[PDB]
Each structure stands twice: as C-alpha cells, then as structure tokens.
C-alpha cells in the first residue's frame, strides 16, 4: 500500500519547492519591476499583494477539496491543478509584462487550490484504514514538504542572484514539471482509482445548488467589480480590501449562520498566529534586505529557515511532547506566547542598535527559531482541539474553520503589513507583537 | 571576483547531479534491458561496461583540457560539453533501443571530458592569483559536487522505483538543463573572457602536430577496429579490453618515453585505490541488491553514501589533519590500508553469515565509511606528492599522471569486476582486498 507515499513524496517535494522557491524571491522581483517602472504599485501595496497571494491560495484550497470530492477526480484535480501551477511559473519565467506577471498569480491560486488539499487527501487513501500505519506516512509526507520548502531558496535564490529572476522562475517551473512527470507516470503504477468523483457525485440533486452559486456568489462578485469601477476607476489596492473582506466574510458568515465563547479567542489566536507565519515571508523578508547585510550569501536564504527549524524541532519536540502530558488547550496558549515573544526581538535591536562587525543576522535567526517553537505548540494540536469541540456544535462546516484561520491570518496581514513598510514607522510594528503576548495570556487564563 | 564561484557551484552541482544520479541506477537499468531482452549482454559484461564508462569519461578529461586550452574557449567548452551530457540523458529518457542507449554513453564521455576539467579550471580563474582566497573557493566548489552527488540518488532512485527509468533519466536530463540554463545566464554576468583559446592558441606551429594525431592515433585506432572485426566479427567484450589496453598504454607509454623507483608503488597504489572507489558504484552496487534487503527504501540510495561521508569527514578531518604534522608520504600509506581493510568487510559477513531481523545493511554502510577514510588520506595529498617529485623528473606531462590514476583504476575494474559477478566466486573478490593491505604495507616500509 505505502509505495504511492514515495510518489506523493516526489509530487509534494517538487510542488512545494516550486511554491516556496518563487514565493521567497517574488517580493524582491516586484521591487525590481517597480524600480524598472514596469509595475506601477507602491512597495507597501507590492508587499500587501504578497499577503493576498497566500490568502487566495488558502481560500481556493477549500474550494479545491469539494471540486474534487463532488465533480472531478482527485487524481486529475492534482494533475491539472499541478499543470496550472506549472504554467503559472512559466508566466513569470517566459512573459515579462507585469500584466502577464499578474496572470501568474491567478494560475498559482487556482492550481494550488486544487493540488495541495487533494494530494494530502490522496496520502490518507494510500492506507485503506491502516490505523497505526496511517499517521506515519502522513508524517513522512510532512517531511517531503519541509525538505522541499527548505531546499527551494538555496537553489532558487542562488539562481536569481547569479542569473536572472526569469531563470529562477524557469527553474521553479522546471521543479513543478518533476512533480507532474513523477506523479502522472508514478501514479499509474500506484494510484488506486480515485480518478473519478467520490461521495457525493450526485446528478439531479446537485444540478440546482451548484448553478445557484454560479449566479449568486460569482455573478454577485462580478457586480461588486462593476460597482467599484463605476464608483471611480480600477482601484488597485481597494481590490486587495475586497479580497480581504471576502476572506473575513466567509468564516464570519459561517460563524453567524451556524450559531462558542471559548472558540472565539482560540479562532482569533489561530488567525493571529498565522498572521506571524506568513509575515515572516514578507515583513521579515523586507527586513532581511533592510537592516541585515548579505555581503556573500543571498537574502532569499532566510526563507529556508522556516522549514529548517520545523524539520529539526519535530524530533526534539516528539520526546518533549510525551512526559508533560502526565504532569491540549494549555499547549495552544503557549504557542501564541512564543509567536508574540519572537516578534518582540525586532523592536529590541531596532531601538538598542547594539551591533558591530558581522554581529546582526542571528537576530533574525533566533526570531524564526522562536516562531517555529510556536508552530510546534499549535499545528499538531489545533486539528484535534477543533475536532474535540465540533460534536457539541455539529461537525459539518466546523472542521473547515481550522484550515480557514491561515486564510484570515494572511488577509489580516494584507492591511497589517502596510504599516511596517512605512520604514520610519517600523519600531511600532514589532511593538504590536506585544499585543500577541497580551492576547496570548488571556488564553492561559481560560 | 568570487561571485562566479556561485555560478560554477550550481554548474557542477547540477552536472554532478546528472552524472552521479543516472550512474547510480544505470547498472540496474542494463539488468532490466537484459531481462526484457533488449540488451544482448552478460550481467558481468553489463557491469564491466559500468567501469569503462568511468575510464573513458576520465580519459576524455585529459583531452578536454588541451582542447579548451589550445583550440576552443573554456566557457564554450563547458557550455557545449554540458549540452552533449544534456542530449546524452535524453538518449536514455527519449530513445528506448539499446543501440541508442549506447550513443548515450558516447555523448556523456565527450561531454564530461570537456565540462568537468574546464569548469574546475574556471574556478581558479575567478581568483586572479588571490593566494589565501583561492583555496577556499576551490573547497566551496568541492562541496557543490558532494551536495550534487549526494542528493541525485535520493531523487533519481526514488523516481526510477516510483515511476519509469526513462522518468528517472528524464529527471537527470532536467538536472543538466539546469546546469546550463543557469551557467549561460550566470556566466554572462560573472565570466572574465576565457571564452577564447588561451596559451597556446598557435596557428602555423600547431597545424602540423594536430593533424598528425588525426591520422596517427585516430586513424590508427580505426585500423584496429577493422583488424578485430575481420579477425572474427563485432567482438562485444573484446572492445572493452581494447579500451582497457588504451587506458593502460597511454600512461605506460608516457612512463617509458620520459624515463622513479619510489613513484611506481605510489602510482600502482593510486591506481589500486581508485579501483575501490569506482568499484563501490558497481560491485558493491550489485551486492546492495544481492545480499541486502530494501523492503521500503531503494538500493540506489547506497550510492549517496560515498559523497555523504566525504562532506561529513572533511570538517572532522580538517582539525585532525593539523596536530599529527607536528608529531605527507606517510599519509599515502595509511590511505591504501583503509581501502583494503574496508573491502575486507565483504568476505567477513559473506563467510560468517551472522545476521537476523533487519541487522545487515549497516555492513555496507561501514565499508563506505571506511573507504572514505582512505579518500581523505589520499585525494588532498596525492596532488602535492606528485608535484613534489615533478621538478626532479621535469614537470611537463608528470602532473597529468595523478589524474590518470582514476582512468587506470577503473580500467583495472573493467576486467577485475567480471570475477565478482560469478556470484558463487564472490568470497574470493573480497579476499583480493587483503592484497591491497599487503601492497599498502610495502608503502609503510618506504
């Protein structure tokens, strides 16, 4: 049965290398278009795009599951999803115009929406309810994503610094090619036919509610574009707010529709937690160029620390996460305390300015290290804490709320990140990180 | 100046990826053609080819230097060299016929002949005689090579086992396209014009001796093919002997032409040392499938140990190789003793058969570990020991004799390897490894 684990290892390594390779250098590329004059956008808005790009991928992740579970196959969803992503990178590498370089994002939103959630669904299917076994392959899949994400800026950064951003994006598109090249030819001799639509693939009972969302949400969203365009003109950063509004509306509408007092601070904490994870790929990435020298090594290589620490903390955290259980909700409170404490290390050097020689990059190393301590205290238990409270409030669209925290955390960043880019108003951005420790201590109480 | 180091790092990272990657699975691929009936060759001859493939690459390495130093540029030699390798891997990926899958070898012989020696010449070139600096970049180059070599089986073997050999090879073919894609566009902004023929690019003084070798060696070799064909027919493994004869003749003719009693055992020791390094990619690779189980993990992943140990031994060997100098030729004697002692670990389990459960793969792990201890005692000092004895016997074609030891060591294996493949006559192959310790103790005396 777990042979396809090693096909899916290649598929997600070769996908995530694509996604986290280009993601690392994309902000710096937008900066470069902006300097060339090809992209008529502010560096604060360019850095905001970076946050939306994450929320729309994570919003489309929800849609990708139910597209593949009720209309098209899980195998073809990952294939076409991956081939859209593969072409999305080709848009950056081959086309040069900022207009084409926006279409890139649209493909990587749709593509990753389909791929990432279904390729994960396909790991669970390797194991036909092999109770013990089933978790191991899911942990070995997690490795392929960390190996994949870690090794991406090491190659892709070295690529755009040594040769063009276009070669780098071409190398990232190459990467995705391998995900597919393996997957298709490796899936045929592995993939148990989840190549068709599983439960529920209904015909007359689903024709009505499917075509309702085509003329209610899609046509309703198209009307809001015409309202905002006739209001004035093509408002460039107000479309970002529209996307931030939709990313906050969907969970809030599902929160008010279904309805609890204990889950609100857990949901806000989760949303506030992922606002630091994706902020490390933007604000801290800006900072890595701003108040950090790189005389010989690239700046993109700071993005490879996020996975480096995950794949190193996990084994040390496995044995630590065993003895304390003798001496679940407590773990969630410790996580946001580490997220806020780690962000506090940016105001400290920023105010003190106590450095000399080459004593500086490690202040960013320690922040990552301390952010990943927060991930280890929330990513494994957050799945079970949401499932433990679901039977009381009916498990239907409650399990989806945990995955959607990353979409609202990065939709917060859309508008939050803009404050850091002020450059002079930078110390107050890390001062807001104290609020995370204050809001984190409220969970320690409960 | 050292920016191009980071282009040449990724060039040789992505070349050694292509080369050492496919090399790992190629024996198992020939076995597969043989089983399918596409390749009419014995597994002993199929395994012999594997050894010639190494000697002809290393023979063409000598030719590649003087082609690029006297007729064409070092940059274009590295470029076109890699393009042949890139075509070469498409031969295995795209064509399916064993005839076409032989043409593969011809391209990777020519290609690696040009690329590998000039890309190394191009690292030294970066540093315009930057005395201290010059060695560091050469050590950072060595890393890319080990990183490149290590990571290839981990991706290519997982690809050949999960999906087709053509995909696995297709992967190597992408791997080389990266080599160039980056190198050409890296080069353009990093390469100080060594894009033309350096000293000696003579015109009338070189037209005569160049066209002499076209009608003396090349036409003389073409006559030997017609002699061997008319003798009987297309002798399949006697062409291997012809190639073994040429690989032993060139250094022996240069040994008798120029002429010493102290260098013969150092040369034989070097030739006998590399006969164990390349034998690990064939005999031990056969063994990894024969008396070693692989229930979950691939067999090609044993080839990734060779570099793994090099990149781990180097730092531990750096501090060890400092204090002993207070308490050069001695180091050469310790190296061949570790080569022979490490090969002795194959007869031990082969005769004793003392194993149970999953207690077995580590007997192959320790042999590699102990072979690389021998590499660390010979690869760094062998360059200086040959150069220390060169001014006494004139430094002209004496410096080339050290690089040619790998060509004669793998040309010995051509005929040596055939004895292991007997399967029943296997314990005597590791018994010959005692002879290396006996011949190694003769150097301890001197």
UniProtKB/TrEMBL annotation, chains A, B:
<dbReference type="InterPro" id="IPR036259">
    <property type="entry name" value="MFS_trans_sf"/>
</dbReference>
<feature type="domain" description="Major facilitator superfamily (MFS) profile">
    <location>
        <begin position="1"/>
        <end position="191"/>
    </location>
</feature>
<dbReference type="InterPro" id="IPR005279">
    <property type="entry name" value="Dipep/tripep_permease"/>
</dbReference>
<keyword id="KW-0812">Transmembrane</keyword>
<feature type="transmembrane region" description="Helical">
    <location>
        <begin position="305"/>
        <end position="324"/>
    </location>
</feature>
<dbReference type="InterPro" id="IPR000109">
    <property type="entry name" value="POT_fam"/>
</dbReference>
<feature type="transmembrane region" description="Helical">
    <location>
        <begin position="238"/>
        <end position="257"/>
    </location>
</feature>
<dbReference type="Pfam" id="PF00854">
    <property type="entry name" value="PTR2"/>
</dbReference>
<dbReference type="InterPro" id="IPR020846">
    <property type="entry name" value="MFS_dom"/>
</dbReference>
<comment type="function">
    <text>Proton-dependent uptake of di- or tri-peptides.</text>
</comment>
<feature type="transmembrane region" description="Helical">
    <location>
        <begin position="260"/>
        <end position="276"/>
    </location>
</feature>
<dbReference type="GO" id="GO:0015333">
    <property type="term" value="F:peptide:proton symporter activity"/>
</dbReference>
<feature type="binding site">
    <location>
        <position position="406"/>
    </location>
    <ligand>
        <name>L-glutamine</name>
    </ligand>
</feature>
<feature type="binding site">
    <location>
        <position position="20"/>
    </location>
    <ligand>
        <name>L-glutamine</name>
    </ligand>
</feature>
<keyword id="KW-1133">Transmembrane helix</keyword>
<dbReference type="GO" id="GO:0071916">
    <property type="term" value="F:dipeptide transmembrane transporter activity"/>
</dbReference>
<feature type="transmembrane region" description="Helical">
    <location>
        <begin position="17"/>
        <end position="34"/>
    </location>
</feature>
<feature type="transmembrane region" description="Helical">
    <location>
        <begin position="399"/>
        <end position="420"/>
    </location>
</feature>
<feature type="binding site">
    <location>
        <position position="20"/>
    </location>
    <ligand>
        <name>L-glutamate</name>
    </ligand>
</feature>
<dbReference type="GO" id="GO:0005886">
    <property type="term" value="C:plasma membrane"/>
</dbReference>
<feature type="transmembrane region" description="Helical">
    <location>
        <begin position="210"/>
        <end position="232"/>
    </location>
</feature>
<keyword id="KW-1003">Cell membrane</keyword>
<feature type="transmembrane region" description="Helical">
    <location>
        <begin position="87"/>
        <end position="115"/>
    </location>
</feature>
<comment type="similarity">
    <text>Belongs to the major facilitator superfamily. Proton-dependent oligopeptide transporter (POT/PTR) (TC 2.A.17) family.</text>
</comment>
<dbReference type="InterPro" id="IPR018456">
    <property type="entry name" value="PTR2_symporter_CS"/>
</dbReference>
<feature type="transmembrane region" description="Helical">
    <location>
        <begin position="333"/>
        <end position="353"/>
    </location>
</feature>
<dbReference type="GO" id="GO:0035443">
    <property type="term" value="P:tripeptide transmembrane transport"/>
</dbReference>
<dbReference type="InterPro" id="IPR050171">
    <property type="entry name" value="MFS_Transporters"/>
</dbReference>
<feature type="transmembrane region" description="Helical">
    <location>
        <begin position="136"/>
        <end position="159"/>
    </location>
</feature>
<feature type="transmembrane region" description="Helical">
    <location>
        <begin position="165"/>
        <end position="186"/>
    </location>
</feature>
<feature type="transmembrane region" description="Helical">
    <location>
        <begin position="46"/>
        <end position="67"/>
    </location>
</feature>
<feature type="transmembrane region" description="Helical">
    <location>
        <begin position="426"/>
        <end position="446"/>
    </location>
</feature>
<feature type="transmembrane region" description="Helical">
    <location>
        <begin position="365"/>
        <end position="387"/>
    </location>
</feature>
<dbReference type="GO" id="GO:0042937">
    <property type="term" value="F:tripeptide transmembrane transporter activity"/>
</dbReference>
<feature type="binding site">
    <location>
        <position position="16"/>
    </location>
    <ligand>
        <name>L-glutamine</name>
    </ligand>
</feature>
<keyword id="KW-0472">Membrane</keyword>
<keyword id="KW-0813">Transport</keyword>
<protein>
    <recommendedName>
        <fullName>Di-/tripeptide transporter</fullName>
    </recommendedName>
</protein>
<feature type="binding site">
    <location>
        <position position="16"/>
    </location>
    <ligand>
        <name>L-glutamate</name>
    </ligand>
</feature>
<feature type="binding site">
    <location>
        <position position="406"/>
    </location>
    <ligand>
        <name>L-glutamate</name>
    </ligand>
</feature>
<feature type="binding site">
    <location>
        <position position="116"/>
    </location>
    <ligand>
        <name>L-glutamine</name>
    </ligand>
</feature>
<dbReference type="GO" id="GO:0042802">
    <property type="term" value="F:identical protein binding"/>
</dbReference>
């Amino acid at each position: 049965q777990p042979l396809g684990l090693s096909t899916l290892f290649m598929t997600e390594m070769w996908e995530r290398f694509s996604y986290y390779g280009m993601r690392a250098i994309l902000l710096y590329y937008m900066w470069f278009l902006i300097s060339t004059g090809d992209l008529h956008i502010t560096r604060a808005t360019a850095a905001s795009i970076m946050a939306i790009y994450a929320s729309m991928v994570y919003l489309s992740g929800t849609i990708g599951g139910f597209v593949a579970d009720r209309i098209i196959g899980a195998r073809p969803a990952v294939f076409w999803g991956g081939v859209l992503i593969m072409l999305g990178h080709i848009v950056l590498a081959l086309p040069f115009g900022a207009s084409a370089l926006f279409g890139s994002i649209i493909l990587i939103i749709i593509g990753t929406g389909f791929l990432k959630p279904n390729v994960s669904t396909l790991v669970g299917t390797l194991y036909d309810e092999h109770d013990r076994r089933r978790d191991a392959g899911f942990s070995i899949f997690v490795f392929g994503i960390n190996l994949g994400a870690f090794i991406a800026p090491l190659i892709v950064g070295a690529a755009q610094e040594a040769a063009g951003y276009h070669v780098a994006f071409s190398l990232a598109a190459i990467g995705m090619f391998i995900g597919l090249l393996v997957y298709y030819f490796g899936g045929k001799k592995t993939l148990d036919p989840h190549y068709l639509r599983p439960t529920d693939p209904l015909a007359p009972e689903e024709v009505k509610p499917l075509l309702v969302k085509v003329s209610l949400a899609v046509a309703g969203f198209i009307a809001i574009i015409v309202v905002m365009n006739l209001v004035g003109w093509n408002s460039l950063p107000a479309y970002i707010n529209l996307l931030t509004i939709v990313a906050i509306a969907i969970p809030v509408f599902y929160f008010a529709w279904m309805i609890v007092v204990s889950y609100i601070p857990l949901f806000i904490a989760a949303v506030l937690f992922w606002a630091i994870e994706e902020q490390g790929s933007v604000v801290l990435a800006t900072f890595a160029a701003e108040r950090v020298d790189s005389s010989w090594f690239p700046v993109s290589w700071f993005q490879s620390l996020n996975p480096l620490f995950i794949m190193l903390y996990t084994p040390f955290f496995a044995w630590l996460w065993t003895a304390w259980k003798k001496n679940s909700p407590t773990k969630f409170a410790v996580g946001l305390m580490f997220a806020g404490l780690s962000f506090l290390l940016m105001a400290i050097p920023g105010a003190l300015y106590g450095t000399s020689g080459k004593v500086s990059p490690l202040w960013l190393v320690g922040s990552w290290a301390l952010v990943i301590l927060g991930e280890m205290l929330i990513s494994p238990v957050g799945l079970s804490v949401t499932t433990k409270l679901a039977p009381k409030a009916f498990n239907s669209q409650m399990m989806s709320m945990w995955f959607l925290s990353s979409s609202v955390g990065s939709a917060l960043n859309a508008q939050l990140v803009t404050l850091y880019n002020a450059k002079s108003e930078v110390a107050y951005f890390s001062y807001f990180g104290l609020g995370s420790v204050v809001l984190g201590i409220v969970l320690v109480f409960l």
